[PDB]
């Protein structure tokens, strides 16, 4: 997260870190057994880390749970990141508490102009690299689809939306991949892609979760 702020420990209790020896992606807890992340975060051997603030220090509220299965969206395209969503099942149910909590799936999509909270442990620099160890947060509005497509002509599908600031300076970044965009209490986006980070006229692009709620609900009920 570039241009954001330190969230505060466990103030985003649905935020998970995906760990394969190191943090490599974010995700969102949607019930005690399931996490939503980005398909571009797919790999084997995932440990889900819940209750995290500083990902390099055991602070006392963590739950570390291995994934038992991962399900990449059936239509994910790795060349374009269309359908950039994946479900991860926990081998044992998380113990839900005020620091480890699920985020509600959208009943309805959100409209342009709605403010959202984006969070993660990704790079905080718009040029170069600095990775924080505590969770960072950013308030950012959904941008119009026309400004999104103007920024990225020929690349935006109906399964994507842009959010952030066309002037630059505030954005998500590498390492935030797969983490949440929460608007009005619903998981509306997943950190997906963009050109650089926090660059002028290059806003963040996010998987449009509301298009996937039927698939999520049917997939978790059958797995
Ligand atoms: N909001 C942002 N500026 C931002 C940008 C990037 C990321 C992390 N996501 C990435 O790094 C993804 C993974 C594959 C390549 N990639 C990218 O974002 C590429 N830079 C652009 C690209 C390549 C192929 C298809 C779609 C988009 C997270 C946030
Ligand atoms: Ca920790």
Swiss-Prot record:
Chief location bin: secreted
InterPro entries per the UniProt record, alphabetical: Peptidase_S1_PA, Peptidase_S1_PA_chymotrypsin, Peptidase_S1A, Serine_Proteases_S1, Trypsin_dom, TRYPSIN_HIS, TRYPSIN_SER
Catalytic activity: Preferential cleavage: Arg-|-Xaa, Lys-|-Xaa
Cysteines engaged in disulfide bonds, as pairs: 7-137, 25-41, 109-210, 116-183, 148-162, 173-197
Positions of the catalytic residues: 40 (charge relay system), 84 (charge relay system), 177 (charge relay system)
Assembly mode: Interacts with SERPINA1.
Record's protein name: Serine protease 1
Originating organism: Bos taurus (Bovine)
